[PDB]
Structure formats: C-alpha cells, structure tokens
Design a protein around this ligand. Structure first.
Ligand SMILES: COC(=O)[C@@H]1CC(=O)N(c2ccccc2)C1
Lengths: 300, 237
C-alpha cells in the first residue's frame, strides 16, 4: 500500500481520492493519503473552497514513482511532484505516519467499485491522451478541451481522445453510405478496434477514462467522448459477444457510482434512450438497463 | 441554416443552388390480396431537383425495378435520392455544381450529407417553407414521362418554359409555386383553369400553356381564387 504525502494544506480545499472525498480546512495539519491500493491507477483531485471554479487533479500510478502534493502560492494550486530521492521520501512518509497526519484510503474489503471503474485504464494510455511527457502523472481539469472540440484552442493542454464522428469519411465507406451510417459495425470493428485501438481493452480503457474525467471534473468534452464510444458500440449490429457483456458491466458500475444529483448534466438523454431502447444492442445491456430504469427513470 | 421567409431572395442570387424534393420517389398503390390482406404495388417515381434561378429541372425517373427485393423502402428511398443527387453533382462540371442544396423534407438531411461527404463546401440545408413540389406529377408531360419509363432515366426540363425571357426568376418561382399549390389543392379545377380555352396551346417543348402577360395575370388570379375557395370548402369559412 502506497502513499501520497502533502507538504501542507495552506488553502481550504475539498480533496478527492478516487471515488472518495474529504474537506481540509485552511492550514489544517494534513499531510496526505496513505494505504492507497497498489495495482490500479488513481486520481487525486481538488476543488478550492473559495473558488469552486476549476476542479483539477492528477492521474497517477504509485508503481511508477514516488509522488507528493505541494501547494504553489504563485500558480494557486496543489501540484503533484515526483520525489526522485527514494530514502528522503520514505523518511518523510514515515514521520507523517508516526504523527498520524494522513488519512487512510478507506477501501471496504467487499468493495470492487474502483477496480470496476478502472478495469481497463492504464497509465500508459492516459499519458497519450494527456500529453505532458516530462511527468509520470497526468493533470486534468474542468476546462480542458478535446482535440475534436478544438477542431470545431491551445494544443498542449488538450485531451487527445480518439476522434469519433459518425458523419465523416472515416466512418463511411464510399459506396456503403446507407449501410455504414445505419449499422456502424465497419467503423467499430475495422476502423476503430482493428485499426486504431488494436483491441477492445484499449477501447474500454479510453471509455472508462472519459467517464471518470466527466464525473470527477465536470469535463464536458470527456462526457461527449464517453457517450460517443457507447453509441458507436450500441449502433453496431455486429459486436463480439464478450464486448457486449463487458460493456454492460462497465456501464453498470458507472451509472451506480454517478452522484444522483449530477445525472441531469452528465447523462445525454438521446444517447441513452437510443442505446437502451432503439439500438441494435437494445437487448444486450440487461444490468445497465435495470439500474438506469430503477435509478434514473425520468431521463427515460 | 434553414431556408425560410426571412431569406427568400437568396434563392435568386447568383450562387448556384438546387432544391431537392423526394416526395415522389417511392410511390405505391395499396390494395387487397386474394386472402384479404393488404399489399402495396410500387409505381414509377421521380426525384425533383430544381434550380430556382434558371428553371432547370433534373427529373431523375425512379423505375420500380430499383425496389425489387429491397426492404424498408421508405428509408431506402431517401438514401437512393441522396445517391442520385450526389451522382448528378459529380456529373456536372465544377462551375455548374451547386454551392447549396436545399431539401424540402428534413429526413433527407442526413442521407444527403452522408452521400456528399466528398463535397464539404456544398451546404445541405432544410427549409421551413411548405413547397408544393409534390404536385410535379400533376404536370401532364412530367407524369407521362415517369409512367412510361421502362428503365432508370434522367429527363431534363425547364420548368419555367420561356418565362424568364419576360419576367424575373423571383416572379417565375412565385408563378410556379402558385400553379403547383393550386394543382395540389384541387388538381381538376387547376387543370380546368389552364386548359379551358381551346385557343391557348402548349408548345411541344413546353410544360405550360403559352399565355400572354395579361392572360397570365388572369390565370394567376384564377389560381389564387381556387386556393382560397378550397380553403373555404375545407375549413367551412
Ligand atoms: C434552351 O437552352 C438551354 O440551354 C436549355 C434551357 C434549359 O432549361 N436547359 C436545361 C434544362 C435542364 C437541365 C439542364 C439544362 C438548357
């Protein structure tokens, strides 16, 4: 179990760690988060008490280095940094743990929620969507736009999700216009899966990463990407049976975890009604349809 | 965006454009089968593609053989229309290709957009106008060429005959839409108005009768009266 120490907490802030969150008061004696489960990516995220504008945070994997947080009073935010000196880091953490200045990642043993939300998310793929190669961890915030959003403005700060556009030459074979527009299997299986993602695991990892950025930061282009990747599968008549079954599980845990009071903004009525009730795969998402119906029947 | 009353004069400017109407592409008669079920029999159809500035009508005849063995015909008809419009555009020299294509029904937007991906600079637009182009099959010579076709065929007409020699496009389009609206509201009465006088004939190479200017005014008045009459008969006013 690994640790993300904090130098200090100089400004009052709500701190998120994965699906958990806690409030730290201004100059409260807080020095980080311990007992973070190894084997998954994680996200630590921030919303300042004084300015709820800009949720921001860092995707990281503790196996890839020793990371800590330190507030920067010039740029006004909590920054993740890597500590290259292994013994210094261990010594700092042990002191903070002895003085019990760290909260404990509060993972219930029965609870597979985080695993289920990040099953296919890899740091190496995150770092290609979020391009900042000098760091081993990836910064995301509320306001970052996607490559697709920028086409329709700073490239260094973009989310490089895979562009999906149903009315594009990539999506539509010359001479198969009606076929390919009404049944997106070509675009899903040949262009996207075989061509770009190489396999369903990479496709699902991006889908899960887009959802998590939508949920934790309110990142609108991430929400668009999540819905587009769902819709591309649901709108394909020919989808491997294992992908459909896994998709149902993936979405189930995403809908289960969504705050009840954010559903209005995070969920696209048209996509969901189409996917559950009108699409080729209308009958292939049993778990997701049951939780959606029992938890968000108004959207439908 | 959408074409409506506010931007009506745009139709007659010097940017090439085409209206596309698909309402007569897929045509059926519904009948009873021997077993007392209902069945359709398709008849020949047509795409109505019109340049409102010039009067040029590209009448692509849709022969019943195109539906043989096909399912979901009313959906296919929109894609076939889009396919044929795209093929027409590609067949035209670059300087004759439209800069805009206006579809009379919004369900044609996605089929045409998809078929025209190769032409990203051609705008595909809907309209809020209720244009009466469905009544094209009430024009006798157009109806005749469609019904007689034994194979797919493109037939070219000027739907304004020679009117542009004497009147502007704006007025010619107004006349056309009034005539077609009347043929759509009461075809029998409209045709009675247009042919009642044995001395006025239709030139072999024309669609409509050879009316003088004064006679067109009389005709146009009679057509308005017809539309208002039908509106009274319909709504009891
Ligand atoms: C008569 O002199 C011409 O140049 C004719 C007039 C006309 O209506 N045309 C046309 C009609 C439909 C499609 C393409 C062209 C060409």
């Amino acid at each position: 179990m690994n640790t993300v120490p904090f130098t200090s907490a100089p400004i009052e802030v709500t701190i998120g760690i994965d699906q958990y969150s806690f409030n730290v008061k201004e100059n409260q004696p807080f020095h980080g988060i311990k007992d973070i489960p190894i084997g998954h990516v994680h996200v630590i995220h921030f919303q300042h008490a004084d300015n709820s504008s800009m949720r921001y945070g860092y995707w990281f994997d503790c196996r890839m280095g020793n990371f800590y947080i330190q507030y920067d009073p010039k740029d006004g935010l909590y920054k993740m940094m890597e500590e290259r000196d292994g013994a210094k880091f261990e010594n700092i953490v042990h002191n903070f743990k002895e003085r019990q200045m760290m909260v404990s990642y509060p993972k219930i043993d029965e609870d597979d929620t985080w695993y289920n939300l990040t099953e296919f998310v890899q740091m190496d793929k995150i770092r290609k969507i979020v391009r900042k190669d000098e760091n081993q961890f990836s910064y995301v915030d509320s306001s970052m736009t996607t490559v697709q959003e920028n086409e329709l403005s700073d490239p260094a700060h973009s989310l490089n999700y895979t562009v999906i556009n149903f009315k594009s030459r990539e999506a539509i074979r010359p001479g198969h216009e009606m076929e390919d527009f009404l049944d997106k299997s070509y675009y899903l299986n040949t262009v996207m899966l075989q061509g770009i993602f190489k396999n369903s695991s990479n496709y699902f990892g991006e889908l899960q990463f887009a959802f998590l950025n939508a949920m934790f930061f309110g990142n609108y282009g991430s929400s668009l990407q999540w819905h587009a990747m769902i819709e591309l599968i649901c709108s394909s008549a020919t989808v491997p049976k294992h992908m459909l079954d896994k998709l149902d599980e993936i979405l189930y845990y995403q809908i289960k975890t969504l705050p009840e009071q954010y559903s209005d903004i995070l969920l696209n009525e048209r996509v969901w009604n189409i996917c559950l009730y009108s699409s080729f795969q209308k009958n292939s998402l049993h778990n997701t349809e049951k939780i959606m119906e029992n938890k968000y029947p108004e959207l439908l | 965006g959408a074409m409506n009353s506010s931007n009506y004069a745009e139709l007659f400017n010097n940017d090439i454009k085409l209206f596309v109407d698909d309402t007569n592409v897929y045509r059926v008669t519904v009948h009873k089968t021997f077993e007392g079920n209902v069945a359709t029999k398709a008849i020949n159809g047509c795409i109505f593609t019109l340049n409102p500035k010039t009067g040029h009508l590209f009448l692509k005849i849709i022969h019943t053989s195109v539906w043989a063995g096909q399912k979901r015909l009313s959906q296919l008809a929109k894609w076939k229309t889009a396919e044929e419009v795209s093929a027409l555009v590609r067949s035209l020299p670059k300087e004759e290709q439209p800069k805009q294509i206006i579809v009379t029904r919004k369900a044609m937007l996605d089929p045409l957009e998809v078929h025209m991906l190769d032409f990203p600079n051609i705008a595909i637009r809907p309209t809020e106008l209720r244009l009466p182009f469905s009544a094209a099959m009430s024009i006798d010579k157009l109806s005749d060429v469609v019904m007689k076709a034994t194979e797919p065929q493109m037939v070219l007409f000027n739907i304004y005959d020679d009117w542009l020699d004497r009147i502007s496009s704006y007025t010619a389009f107004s006349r056309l839409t009034l005539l077609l609206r009347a043929l759509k509201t009461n075809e029998e009465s409209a045709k009675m108005i247009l042919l009642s006088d044995p001395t006025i004939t239709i030139k072999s190479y024309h669609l409509w009768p050879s009316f003088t200017d004064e006679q067109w005014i009389t005709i146009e008045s009679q057509m308005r009266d017809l539309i208002l009459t039908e509106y009274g008969r319909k709504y009891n006013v």
